[PDB]
Amino acid sequence: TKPLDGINVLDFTHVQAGPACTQMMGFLGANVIKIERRGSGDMTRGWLQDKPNVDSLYFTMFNCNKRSIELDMKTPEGKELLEQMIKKADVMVENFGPGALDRMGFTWEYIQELNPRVILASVKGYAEGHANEHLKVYENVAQCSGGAAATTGFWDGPPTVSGAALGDSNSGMHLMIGILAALEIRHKTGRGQKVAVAMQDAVLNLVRIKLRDQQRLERTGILAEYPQAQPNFAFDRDGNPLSFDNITSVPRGGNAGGGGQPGWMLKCKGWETDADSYVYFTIAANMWPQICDMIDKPEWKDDPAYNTFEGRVDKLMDIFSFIETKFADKDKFEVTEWAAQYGIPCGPVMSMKELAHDPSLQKVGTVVEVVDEIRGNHLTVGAPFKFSGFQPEITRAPLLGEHTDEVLKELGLDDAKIKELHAKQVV
Amino acid sequence: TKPLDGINVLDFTHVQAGPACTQMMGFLGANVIKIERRGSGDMTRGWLQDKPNVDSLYFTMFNCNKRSIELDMKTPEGKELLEQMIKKADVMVENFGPGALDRMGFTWEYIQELNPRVILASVKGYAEGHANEHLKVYENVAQCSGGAAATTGFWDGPPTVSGAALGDSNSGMHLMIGILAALEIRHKTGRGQKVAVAMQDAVLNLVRIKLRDQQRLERTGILAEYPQAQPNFAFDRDGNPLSFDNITSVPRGGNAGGGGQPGWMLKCKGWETDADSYVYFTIAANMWPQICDMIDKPEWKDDPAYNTFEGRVDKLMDIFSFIETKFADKDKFEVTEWAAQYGIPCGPVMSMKELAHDPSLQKVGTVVEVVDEIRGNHLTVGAPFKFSGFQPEITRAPLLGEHTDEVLKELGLDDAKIKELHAKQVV
Ligand SMILES: *SCCNC(=O)CCNC(=O)[C@H](O)C(C)(C)COP(=O)(O)OP(=O)(O)OC[C@H]1O[C@@H](n2cnc3c(N)ncnc32)[C@H](O)[C@@H]1OP(=O)(O)O
Ligand SMILES: *SCCNC(=O)CCNC(=O)[C@H](O)C(C)(C)COP(=O)(O)OP(=O)(O)OC[C@H]1O[C@@H](n2cnc3c(N)ncnc32)[C@H](O)[C@@H]1OP(=O)(O)O
Ligand SMILES: [Cl-]
Numbered sequence: 128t129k130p131l132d133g134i135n136v137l138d139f140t141h142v143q144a145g146p147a148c149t150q151m152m153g154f155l156g157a158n159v160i161k162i163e164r165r166g167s168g169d170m171t172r173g174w175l176q177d178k179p180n181v182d183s184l185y186f187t188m189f190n191c192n193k194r195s196i197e198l199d200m201k202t203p204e205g206k207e208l209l210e211q212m213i214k215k216a217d218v219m220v221e222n223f224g225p226g227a228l229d230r231m232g233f234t235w236e237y238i239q240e241l242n243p244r245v246i247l248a249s250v251k252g253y254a255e256g257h258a259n260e261h262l263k264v265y266e267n268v269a270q271c272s273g274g275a276a277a278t279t280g281f282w283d284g285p286p287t288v289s290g291a292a293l294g295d296s297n298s299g300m301h302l303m304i305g306i307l308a309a310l311e312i313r314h315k316t317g318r319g320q321k322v323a324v325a326m327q328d329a330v331l332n333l334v335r336i337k338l339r340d341q342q343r344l345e346r347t348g349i350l351a352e353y354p355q356a357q358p359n360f361a362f363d364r365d366g367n368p369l370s371f372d373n374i375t376s377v378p379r380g381g382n383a384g385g386g387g388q389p390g391w392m393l394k395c396k397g398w399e400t401d402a403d404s405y406v407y408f409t410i411a412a413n414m415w416p417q418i419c420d421m422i423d424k425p426e427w428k429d430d431p432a433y434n435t436f437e438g439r440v441d442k443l444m445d446i447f448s449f450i451e452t453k454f455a456d457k458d459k460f461e462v463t464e465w466a467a468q469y470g471i472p473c474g475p476v477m478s479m480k481e482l483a484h485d486p487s488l489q490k491v492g493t494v495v496e497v498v499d500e501i502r503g504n505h506l507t508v509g510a511p512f513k514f515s516g517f518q519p520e521i522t523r524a525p526l527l528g529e530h531t532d533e534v535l536k537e538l539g540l541d542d543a544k545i546k547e548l549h550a551k552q553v554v
Numbered sequence: 555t556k557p558l559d560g561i562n563v564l565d566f567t568h569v570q571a572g573p574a575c576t577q578m579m580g581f582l583g584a585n586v587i588k589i590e591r592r593g594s595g596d597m598t599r600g601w602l603q604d605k606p607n608v609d610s611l612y613f614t615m616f617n618c619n620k621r622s623i624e625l626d627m628k629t630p631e632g633k634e635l636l637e638q639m640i641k642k643a644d645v646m647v648e649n650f651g652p653g654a655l656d657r658m659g660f661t662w663e664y665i666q667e668l669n670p671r672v673i674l675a676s677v678k679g680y681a682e683g684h685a686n687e688h689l690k691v692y693e694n695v696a697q698c699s700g701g702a703a704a705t706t707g708f709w710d711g712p713p714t715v716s717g718a719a720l721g722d723s724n725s726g727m728h729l730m731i732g733i734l735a736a737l738e739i740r741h742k743t744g745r746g747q748k749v750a751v752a753m754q755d756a757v758l759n760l761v762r763i764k765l766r767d768q769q770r771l772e773r774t775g776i777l778a779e780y781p782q783a784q785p786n787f788a789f790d791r792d793g794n795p796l797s798f799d800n801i802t803s804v805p806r807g808g809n810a811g812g813g814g815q816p817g818w819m820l821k822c823k824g825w826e827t828d829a830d831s832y833v834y835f836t837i838a839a840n841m842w843p844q845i846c847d848m849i850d851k852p853e854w855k856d857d858p859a860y861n862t863f864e865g866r867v868d869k870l871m872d873i874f875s876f877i878e879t880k881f882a883d884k885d886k887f888e889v890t891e892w893a894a895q896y897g898i899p900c901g902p903v904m905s906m907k908e909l910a911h912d913p914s915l916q917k918v919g920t921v922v923e924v925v926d927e928i929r930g931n932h933l934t935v936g937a938p939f940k941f942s943g944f945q946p947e948i949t950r951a952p953l954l955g956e957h958t959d960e961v962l963k964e965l966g967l968d969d970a971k972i973k974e975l976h977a978k979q980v981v
């Protein structure tokens with residue numbers, strides 16, 4: 128019915144990457160038990176709160192479909208409690224620092240002894256065996272490590288961070304592939320495995336297209352689809368010309384097409400006061416006649432200076448600036464509608480306000496209103512994969528330690544034994 | 555044992571999103587049969603070739619661990635071949651336009667009729683049910699649709715695309731989670747499902763943090779950690795101080811942290827001639843005196859308006875401007891090690907030439923040199939998930955129609971039938 132019905136997940140994860148993974152597993156039916164430290168819990172509970180003493184949207188948008196237990200794991204009685212939980216678990220997920228889980232006496236070797244079928248899944252900054260294996264890494268450092276910062280932004284500006292979570296959430300989704308892959312192994316062998324994703328590596332996987340460019344750049348000396356390939360277009364902050372004559376590593380291309388065909392971010396009406404009043408407009412090679420029709424340049428259809436990719440290289444940025452002139456009195460939706468008539472790939476820059484209140488995204492289950500009778504309802508992002516015979520049922524994030532007694536009951540413990548654990552301050 | 559050994563994948567995909575999913579399935583041991591159009595095949599083959607009449611790096615880096623068959627599906631004998639293949643398939647993957655397989659006679663109900671166990675996996679632009687259900691979307695258009703472009707870049711510049719493939723490869727990785735999930739459903743129900751990932755939703759999943767920020771902004775009217783919330787720092791195009799007074803949708807924050815822990819991108823030695831001579835510097839609350847030890851400012855530990863997040867989030871660009879001054883004579887690696895002495899989270903902007911030839915990444919199998927005896931060797935990105943009981947074996951991408959007869963012989967067709975299919979121009 129739901130993909131991960133009956134999968135028990137022992138969840139040690141905190142902050143963004145790990146919780147993203149286990150929340151999505153939760154959305155697909157997994158039984159997720161969140162192990163948190165006493166008093167404070169996941170640090171996201173108290174970061175960027177919109178209301179004092181209420182769990183922040185940081186926490187609640189990453190921790191739906193979970194239960195929370197409190198546990199001091201650096202105590203003898205906390206360690207025997209884990210062992211019982213590990214024996215019930217199908218998957219153990221963690222994103223502590225590199226040596227953290229081993230130094231608690233729960234090495235992969237010992238975990239295998241406790242439960243032969245359990246999968247250990249971890250997110251790290253860098254892969255095991257890497258020179259930076261032992262480093263603690265945060266979102267933007269991870270983007271810098273994996274090639275994304277170097278290849279994002281403008282030639283005359285700094286390396287630029289992406290607003291998308293290429294380090295954290297991306298690494299969590301990659302780990303989900305790892306976990307589900309290990310579940311498929313287990314069907315054959317009957318044994319669990321260890322799966323690990325480095326944030327640097329998850330970033331690199333998405334920057335594969337720029338490793339393509341690096342090799343083209345080495346082999347040929349030029350990237351013809353880049354703005355710097357147009358003579359006399361790009362300059363540094365001191366007015367020096369930028370060209371591929373002197374470029375040996377993949378440059379920042381502004382709003383160039385990347386893995387798509389050539390494109391640019393073009394202003395629409397009201398761009399001076401509206402930060403998101405833009406479209407992205409693509410010049411696909413086989414759509415040049417249609418573009419010529421749209422912008423009333425019939426003379427450009429038969430001109431070899433304009434009618435091939437190769438002819439347009441010395442003037443592509445001039446072509447985009449001319450096209451942009453046609454959008455000066457039209458908003459982004461009107462431009463997108465106009466382009467659609469011609470079959471030209473083109474779409475608006477959607478603001479976060481526009482996305483948060485879009486009826487379509489709520490219709491399809493991608494933006495979801497979570498019912499939270501304790502904190503008030505909030506929006507979250509649902510499952511991005513849609514299935515023919517399954518619908519996620521998203522439910523609110525747990526309060527700290529809300530299910531501690533509930534899970535101890537399930538472990539076999541009776542009332543008196545729980546009373547002792549509370550008294551010893553282990554839970 | 556590899557996770558997807560024995561999984562037959564009937565692969566119709568082209569360009570990036572679809573092929574990234576099936577390649578990665580191939581890396582995990584899947585049997586990927588790439589259906590390609592006679593005489594031309596996947597568009598990437600001729601897309602920015604570095605060598606005339608040799609398959610491009612775009613093709614080779616997205617199509618390793620696959621076999622190629624040429625097939626004319628708009629013929630009666632071709633449809634008969636496809637039906638035999640669909641009966642052997644575990645997963646069918648496509649990124650055609652809406653209704654393409656329907657128009658070839660292969661609706662879902664008919665696929666189910668041929669094979670009740672087969673999974674049909676699709677990438678699309680917008681989710682089924684969306685108002686933009688049929689708009690064409692690729693890479694940067696999808697980045698614009700899902701909120702990433704709006705929230706990436708600078709307040710006084712345009713919405714900015716990520717160099718990371720937030721649209722294409724990210725959707726492909728998300729589809730891989732969907733496919734593995736549908737394989738888990740099948741273990742219980744014994745039936746195949748449809749699973750689909752829309753590019754917009756794949757992008758939205760990674761901008762969950764900005765949907766958090768949009769709700770915070772709506773609820774409180776301000777985002778305290780954003781540059782626009784700092785005392786006279788962000789200036790609009792007209793050279794006047796910015797603030798959240800007229801900001802109702804999540805703005806662009808340049809190189810800010812994007813979470814609970816502030817940061818900025820800082821220049822290192824050689825930045826005027828080396829575009830990637832930078833470090834990212836993160837102020838994490840749990841090592842603030844450590845930063846004060848490195849920066850040699852002991853007055854800020856004692857000062858209450860410097861030692862806490864609430865106190866420090868109005869001196870913020872004043873602090874980064876200061877720290878950058880003493881990286882003036884040091885390269886990014888020297889600066890990173892100098893910070894690492896004090897346990898500070900500081901990391902270098904890695905260029906693509908550094909990443910392409912980094913020994914560590916090749917040691918861990920994240921950057922892999924592919925032995926390609928036909929075209930000459932090339933680099934690619936490997937599997938970002940590392941497993942304890944399994945190693946991917948990456949093999950070169952197929953020539954067009956290289957495995958046609960090999961695949962036909964597996965369907966059980968004789969040498970007479972195969973040679974007349976060539977003569978009939980079906981394969
Ligand atoms: S997506 C952005 C975050 N990046 C990652 O997910 C990458 C992996 N995570 C990390 O590198 C670190 O976890 C980061 C996120 C950098 C935070 O660093 P911390 O300073 O918080 O270091 P740890 O997370 O490893 O935690 C420190 C020690 O605390 C112990 N601990 C946690 N929870 C408990 C409980 N419940 N009970 C007892 N101890 C607990 C950890 O074991 C760890 O122990 P050390 O021995 O001190 O390492
Ligand atoms: S990372 C972002 C990357 N950006 C891009 O990819 C932008 C460029 N993309 C494109 O131009 C198109 O998306 C391409 C790659 C050309 C794919 O277009 P389609 O989705 O239409 O796929 P096809 O070109 O392969 O199909 C065209 C029509 O022909 C039918 N068809 C496909 N393959 C075959 C074979 N082997 N045999 C017979 N017929 C085949 C399709 O069903 C399709 O039919 P329509 O009914 O016209 O849709
Ligand atoms: Cl995230």
Ligand SMILES: [Cl-]
Binds near residue numbers: 472
């Ligand atoms: Cl495109």
Ligand SMILES: [Cl-]
Binds near residue numbers: 569571572722
């Ligand atoms: Cl694609």
Ligand SMILES: [Mg+2]
Binds near residue numbers: 373374
């Ligand atoms: Mg050069």
Ligand SMILES: [Mg+2]
Binds near residue numbers: 419
């Ligand atoms: Mg006209």
